[PDB]
Swiss-Prot record, chain B:
Region (Disordered): 1-36
Statement: the UniProt record of this protein carries the keyword Nucleotidyltransferase: no
Protein name (Swiss-Prot/TrEMBL): Large ribosomal subunit protein eL29
Assembly: Component of the large ribosomal subunit (LSU). Mature yeast ribosomes consist of a small (40S) and a large (60S) subunit. The 40S small subunit contains 1 molecule of ribosomal RNA (18S rRNA) and 33 different proteins (encoded by 57 genes). The large 60S subunit contains 3 rRNA molecules (25S, 5.8S and 5S rRNA) and 46 different proteins (encoded by 81 genes).
Organism: Saccharomyces cerevisiae (strain ATCC 204508 / S288c)
UniProtKB/Swiss-Prot annotation, chain C:
A biological process from GO: cytoplasmic translation
Role summary: Component of the ribosome, a large ribonucleoprotein complex responsible for the synthesis of proteins in the cell. The small ribosomal subunit (SSU) binds messenger RNAs (mRNAs) and translates the encoded message by selecting cognate aminoacyl-transfer RNA (tRNA) molecules. The large subunit (LSU) contains the ribosomal catalytic site termed the peptidyl transferase center (PTC), which catalyzes the formation of peptide bonds, thereby polymerizing the amino acids delivered by tRNAs into a polypeptide chain.
One Pfam family it belongs to: Ribosomal_L18
Origin organism lineage: Eukaryota, Fungi, Dikarya, Ascomycota, Saccharomycotina
Modified residues (N6,N6,N6-trimethyllysine): K49
Organism encoding this protein: Saccharomyces cerevisiae (strain ATCC 204508 / S288c)
Name recorded for this polypeptide: Large ribosomal subunit protein eL18A
GO MF term (any one): RNA binding
Chief place of localization: cytoplasm
Miscellaneous notes: There are 2 genes for eL18 in yeast.
Cross-link (Glycyl lysine isopeptide (Lys-Gly) (interchain with G-Cter in ubiquitin)): K115
GO cellular component: cytosol; cytosolic large ribosomal subunit
This protein's UniProt keywords: Cytoplasm, Isopeptide bond, Methylation, Ribonucleoprotein, Ribosomal protein, Ubl conjugation
PANTHER family: 60S RIBOSOMAL PROTEIN L18 (PTHR10934), LARGE RIBOSOMAL SUBUNIT PROTEIN EL18 (PTHR10934:SF2)
Curated annotation (Swiss-Prot), chain D:
Subcellular location: Cytoplasm
Alphabetized Pfam families for the sequence: Ribosomal_L21e
Keyword terms of this UniProt record: Cytoplasm, Isopeptide bond, Ribonucleoprotein, Ribosomal protein, Ubl conjugation
Family: Belongs to the eukaryotic ribosomal protein eL21 family.
Descriptive protein name: Large ribosomal subunit protein eL21A
Role according to the record: Component of the ribosome, a large ribonucleoprotein complex responsible for the synthesis of proteins in the cell. The small ribosomal subunit (SSU) binds messenger RNAs (mRNAs) and translates the encoded message by selecting cognate aminoacyl-transfer RNA (tRNA) molecules. The large subunit (LSU) contains the ribosomal catalytic site termed the peptidyl transferase center (PTC), which catalyzes the formation of peptide bonds, thereby polymerizing the amino acids delivered by tRNAs into a polypeptide chain.
SUPFAM superfamilies named in the record: Translation proteins SH3-like domain
Disulfide bonds, paired cysteine numbers: none
Curated annotation (Swiss-Prot), chain F:
Subunit and partners: Component of the large ribosomal subunit (LSU). Mature yeast ribosomes consist of a small (40S) and a large (60S) subunit. The 40S small subunit contains 1 molecule of ribosomal RNA (18S rRNA) and 33 different proteins (encoded by 57 genes). The large 60S subunit contains 3 rRNA molecules (25S, 5.8S and 5S rRNA) and 46 different proteins (encoded by 81 genes).
Cellular location(s): Cytoplasm
Full protein name: Large ribosomal subunit protein eL13A
Species for this entry: Saccharomyces cerevisiae (strain ATCC 204508 / S288c)
Superkingdom to which the source organism belongs: Eukaryota
Entry similarity comment: Belongs to the eukaryotic ribosomal protein eL13 family.
Note: Present with 133000 molecules/cell in log phase SD medium.
Stretches of the chain forming a coiled coil according to its record: none
Portion of the full sequence shown: 2 to 50 of 199
Physiological role: Component of the ribosome, a large ribonucleoprotein complex responsible for the synthesis of proteins in the cell. The small ribosomal subunit (SSU) binds messenger RNAs (mRNAs) and translates the encoded message by selecting cognate aminoacyl-transfer RNA (tRNA) molecules. The large subunit (LSU) contains the ribosomal catalytic site termed the peptidyl transferase center (PTC), which catalyzes the formation of peptide bonds, thereby polymerizing the amino acids delivered by tRNAs into a polypeptide chain.
Amino acid sequence: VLKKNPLKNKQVLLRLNPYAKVFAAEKLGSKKAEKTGTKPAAVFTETLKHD
Amino acid sequence: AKSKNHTAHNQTRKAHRNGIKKPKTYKYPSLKGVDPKFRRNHKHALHGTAKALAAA
Amino acid sequence: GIDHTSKQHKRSGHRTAPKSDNVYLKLLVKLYTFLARRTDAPFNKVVLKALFLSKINRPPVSVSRIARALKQEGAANKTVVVVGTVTDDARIFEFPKTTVAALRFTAGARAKIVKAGGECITLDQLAVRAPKGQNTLILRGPRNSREAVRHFGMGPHKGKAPRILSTGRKFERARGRRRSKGFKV
Amino acid sequence: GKSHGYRSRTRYMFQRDFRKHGAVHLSTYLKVYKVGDIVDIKANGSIQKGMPHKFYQGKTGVVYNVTKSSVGVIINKMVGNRYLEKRLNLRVEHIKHSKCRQEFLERVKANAAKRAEAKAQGVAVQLKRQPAQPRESRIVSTEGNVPQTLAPVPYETFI
Amino acid sequence: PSRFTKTRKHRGHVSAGKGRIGKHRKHPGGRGMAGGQHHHRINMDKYHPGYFGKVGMRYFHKQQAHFWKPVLNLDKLWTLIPEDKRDQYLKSASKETAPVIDTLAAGYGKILGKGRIPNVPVIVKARFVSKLAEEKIRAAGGVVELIA
Amino acid sequence: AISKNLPILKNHFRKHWQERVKVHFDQAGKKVSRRNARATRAAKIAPRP
Amino acid sequence: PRKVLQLLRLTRINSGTFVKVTKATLELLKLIEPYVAYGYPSYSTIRQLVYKRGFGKINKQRVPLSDNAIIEANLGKYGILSIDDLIHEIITVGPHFKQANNFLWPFKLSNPSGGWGVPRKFKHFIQGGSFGNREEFINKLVKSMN
RNA sequence: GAAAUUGUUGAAAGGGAAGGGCAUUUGAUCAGACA
RNA sequence: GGAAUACUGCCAGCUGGGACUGAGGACUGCGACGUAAGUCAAGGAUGCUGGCAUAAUGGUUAUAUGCCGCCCGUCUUGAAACACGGACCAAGGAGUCUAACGUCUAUGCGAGUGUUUGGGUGUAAAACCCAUACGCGUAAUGAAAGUGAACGUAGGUUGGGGCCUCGCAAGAGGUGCACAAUCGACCGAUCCUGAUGUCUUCGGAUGGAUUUGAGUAAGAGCAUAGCUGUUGGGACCCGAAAG
RNA sequence: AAAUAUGUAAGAAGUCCUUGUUACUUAAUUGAACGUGGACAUUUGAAUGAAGAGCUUUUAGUGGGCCAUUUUUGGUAAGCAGAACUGGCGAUGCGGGAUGAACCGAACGUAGAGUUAAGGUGCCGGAAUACACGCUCAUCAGACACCACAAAAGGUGUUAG
RNA sequence: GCCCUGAAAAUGGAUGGCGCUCAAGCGUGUUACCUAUACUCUACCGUCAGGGUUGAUAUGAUGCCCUGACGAGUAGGCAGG
RNA sequence: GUGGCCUAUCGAUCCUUUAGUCCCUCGGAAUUUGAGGCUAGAGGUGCCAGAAAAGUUACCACAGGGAUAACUGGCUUGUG
Ligand SMILES: [Cl-]
Ligand SMILES: [Cl-]
Ligand SMILES: [Cl-]
Ligand SMILES: [Cl-]
Ligand SMILES: [Mg+2]
Ligand SMILES: [Mg+2]
Ligand SMILES: [Mg+2]
Ligand SMILES: [Mg+2]
Ligand SMILES: [Mg+2]
Ligand SMILES: [Mg+2]
Ligand SMILES: [Mg+2]
Ligand SMILES: [Mg+2]
Ligand SMILES: [Mg+2]
Ligand SMILES: [Mg+2]
Ligand SMILES: [Mg+2]
Ligand SMILES: [Mg+2]
Ligand SMILES: [Mg+2]
Ligand SMILES: [Mg+2]
Ligand SMILES: [Mg+2]
Ligand SMILES: [Mg+2]
Ligand SMILES: [Mg+2]
Ligand SMILES: [Mg+2]
Ligand SMILES: [Mg+2]
Ligand SMILES: [Mg+2]
Ligand SMILES: [Mg+2]
Ligand SMILES: [Mg+2]
Ligand SMILES: [Mg+2]
Ligand SMILES: [Mg+2]
Ligand SMILES: [Mg+2]
Ligand SMILES: [Mg+2]
Ligand SMILES: [Mg+2]
Ligand SMILES: [Mg+2]
Ligand SMILES: [Mg+2]
Ligand SMILES: [Mg+2]
Ligand SMILES: [Mg+2]
Ligand SMILES: [Mg+2]
Ligand SMILES: [Mg+2]
Ligand SMILES: [Mg+2]
Ligand SMILES: [Mg+2]
Ligand SMILES: [Mg+2]
Ligand SMILES: [Mg+2]
Ligand SMILES: [Mg+2]
């Protein structure tokens, strides 16, 4: 009789998608990325700044 | 007093209200215009194969 | 605004009730409305629609047509169902011992069926015996044999009957129907 | 007054091709046509007998009759708001076999071959054509292909 | 009845269903069958081919009683016997007990043979008969007697 | 004047036909008159049939 | 162009649908370019569209997708049994994309909350208008209209 | 004993027409529930 | 060389202020929080409290203010028109009836159908009852003389609802009315072939033909009534110059 | 020799293996046409869509049109005359162009809230006498599509090149 | 490029009016803001479509109820009053 | 090879006339003339889907028409 919008009604958000509880508990919306150290080659940099 | 002579304005729109019907295709089309000599022998051929299946 | 693809508020174009005010016909409609809703049997759906048909859409079925249908291989012990009138036919000299369910029986048709050992029953009696149309056989009469049909689609080279009151030598056999008078059709 | 003769407005349509006048080559007369074949109509201007009307130029139909020097073709023609069936008696000079379906026959043959090849071991033979798909990812090397810079050029007359 | 006609529905609508442009005038196009060859030709050539002209030969002072000859087919021949007596004759198909059917007394002139009759001898009296009708009657063991 | 697919009609009403219309309103009245006339004739002619 | 819009189930202003990209559909988008705005949707945009304005076509009726049961009862034969399964089939164009996409009723969006960002819509996005292919910028527009 | 039209009395408005639609102020007037 | 910040994007991160709405009316569904019992923001508002109980709210009406509003009807591509009718009010004022018909629908009976020209009878223009005919239908086709509808389960083929068998189902097989397409058979007309026999010119068997018919092939019609449409009638209403 | 338009095809009424009928056809069981029986199921033969598809009867009004973009004929030209495709007006209100049958936006059951279109935000008049870089001074400045007009030729006016 | 000369019509007069000069003018760029019978959500009326419900002991199975979509209109057609 | 290399070169009903078939009818029954039918052409309608047709009105009439001319006004400006 009345459509209730998930993402603002928490109970409806849990009726569908039971994984929402796990997503919120582990803060999967703010996951840290693993650091890398690759650097561009000299050809890439000289082409970018070339006139 | 002079009036309009001819135009095709609005004619295509009228034709698309219910029209543009592809012709209905039938198995066993009519043999109108087929060669009479072929049809004379085809009639005899069909009578012969009708007896064979019935008497089988 | 909506760019409609089809006509709005269009009726289905099929009859959902009899046009008649017959009180007994409405009782049969009520009986088979219930059966069609709660039996999921295709026989009941067909019968319910047949009760809505007009007179020209329910042509009579003669006993000779019934007798021929009972000569089908394996159909000799089935109950013939005719939603309409069953008429008598004296051109046939032998009739089987079948059972026929119909809305109406003419006086001659009933006598012929009974004297052969059969029985004539109504559609409410049929529902009691076969609530799901077990071992039934529905027969329909010819529709295009009606006299009005032969005038439909009149035109050149069509071969249809003209609408005419008096038929004879001087009535629509001149120019237009023979090559000696202008042209033929 | 207006003129609407049988061959009206066919000045260029029925002309022969450039440096292609004269008699018809013999391969036109050696081809065999059977009922149910798909042919397309193109009139030859040097054969005045059994010639189609200008409307059927460039149309495709199905053979329904075979005679001594001609075939019968069925064409669907749009008149008003419907299509009417037209039957044409055309000499073989004005028709040729259509390749709009001859190419389709080999796809039927290949589908049967692929179906039988994978019948013993494979599932989902995927005998359906698909449209062109978006390109996948790739890596473009600059080894020996260093990008060359381009700039717009000024206006020059050079007349 | 007037209360169910569309005239009642048209009250208050100016044109009464006849249109504003064309209107409802007296006799546009003429009266009766006027212009059957000039401006109503298309409606006459179709729906009524053969209307104009003469074909056959005249017959002065026709009397329809001279041509009275109703036809009866074999498939309805046994309906001329009363129903109470049909059954005994059918089950007793033999000579010297063959029913006599006088088709003229039933208002028929000629007997045509279309259907099939039971294999029962029957004496059929008629003014006229077709060739096929006589053969089927004789095939079942009956005879045809000509009367006037 | 001629339209649609309809039978050709021949209704002969081009004279002053409304002046010669006869409606048999006295169908029941004449039946009573004939029965009365037969009764009074039987009484007049004795036991004649 | 009117016919192409009907074939894409875009029959009123601010209606939206998903289209799989092939050669057969790229030519369709060219014909209706001055009448539509389209681009490449992200996972966030797809998730919010289905959750808030997702309706299913069940027996020729528009039914809100408020429970996983109705999705399973209509798309369970294709292996789709939850609202996230339906989203997964959309964002990753899978074997049953056509059935999953046609199941969803055409989205009914409103006008953008912050406006269109241009004084005149009916020019190409490149020329400062609104129509045509705006690539990833479609996500900002749709979320304003959702 | 109706209407057009008119007299008297009472009320109201009126800076080159009058009349109308939506909304509310002011004046006059009025039904409903007091369970 | 190590950071910061800007820009763009994401969060099933948190939280404050404002407006509109409260449809439904026992229970039933999906979930959440809980060891449990139970609870909940989970298939649509409840709890607490005050004033007044009457012209206070509200309705009606007149007027005032803001914004908006050209005279209706008619012909017309186009009317507020410098296009036509209309000063005002009351009453009257225009698709009718009839003969014969098309389509459709309802009703009775059904290879038949129609009692009402007339007779009988009567509580007397009603109601009730009835013989013989006649109309239409049940045979068509030819200008006519004339002839006249089954090789066959009243044919074969393709598609067909329903029913039958098996099967959990999906399906497969069987039978297939109506209807659609097509090839045949039958009757009449036309054009050919011309047997046994002869008032020697009659008779027309048998077998054919890119010919033709408003035909046959287990009948559907007759009667009454209604809307709509047709024709003749004053014929939707009013109107000529004439004869 | 284009562009735009335009014909046909993308399977079950299909493909393949074997062999039955005939008065047609072949030197010839050669071919043609129509069939019996067997094998191949709906990733069954591209995409997208499909308020279902097919079919029949009957009858109203209408048969003076006009306008806009593009193509286009006659004419010096015309709010002129005549064609082509499409969209409109006529038959249609609503927001915008002061005003207007046709232009722009958008098409209408009765209401509430929110957001916009075209067009606008000094005052009339709801909304920034907002922000930013320049140009222009007219003793007849200029001011917004359809649209209610201005040219050839000139100025050490001023600006940039 | 802007401005000016070229540039003459008859009642008094119209960037819509007032008026405006680092504009309230012209070219261009960035934002905020205003409001349609259009879009989004909700209620109510009607129309159409798909469905549920005869089991008595309570009255409309042409009844009651569930679900979805839709609503411009001259000439003209049909339906309910 | 079923007329002209192809794209034009032509004509209903009623009536008349000719050829064919020597067939059908003249209705109380026959013979012979005559007449009427059946099939195929010709004689023509050029306003060419096909009425048989001279003027005048400054003595004039009616139904209508701004669907349409003789004044202004409006658009246009060749011409002036
Ligand atoms: Cl037009
Ligand atoms: Cl009505
Ligand atoms: Cl006011
Ligand atoms: Cl004959
Ligand atoms: Mg015209
Ligand atoms: Mg030639
Ligand atoms: Mg009206
Ligand atoms: Mg009128
Ligand atoms: Mg008219
Ligand atoms: Mg009239
Ligand atoms: Mg003429
Ligand atoms: Mg805002
Ligand atoms: Mg804008
Ligand atoms: Mg008095
Ligand atoms: Mg008064
Ligand atoms: Mg108040
Ligand atoms: Mg006011
Ligand atoms: Mg005011
Ligand atoms: Mg005003
Ligand atoms: Mg005018
Ligand atoms: Mg007016
Ligand atoms: Mg007038
Ligand atoms: Mg006046
Ligand atoms: Mg009155
Ligand atoms: Mg009156
Ligand atoms: Mg009447
Ligand atoms: Mg006179
Ligand atoms: Mg007219
Ligand atoms: Mg004009
Ligand atoms: Mg009009
Ligand atoms: Mg303006
Ligand atoms: Mg303000
Ligand atoms: Mg500016
Ligand atoms: Mg709105
Ligand atoms: Mg609407
Ligand atoms: Mg409406
Ligand atoms: Mg020559
Ligand atoms: Mg005589
Ligand atoms: Mg002519
Ligand atoms: Mg003449
Ligand atoms: Mg004029
Ligand atoms: Mg000059």
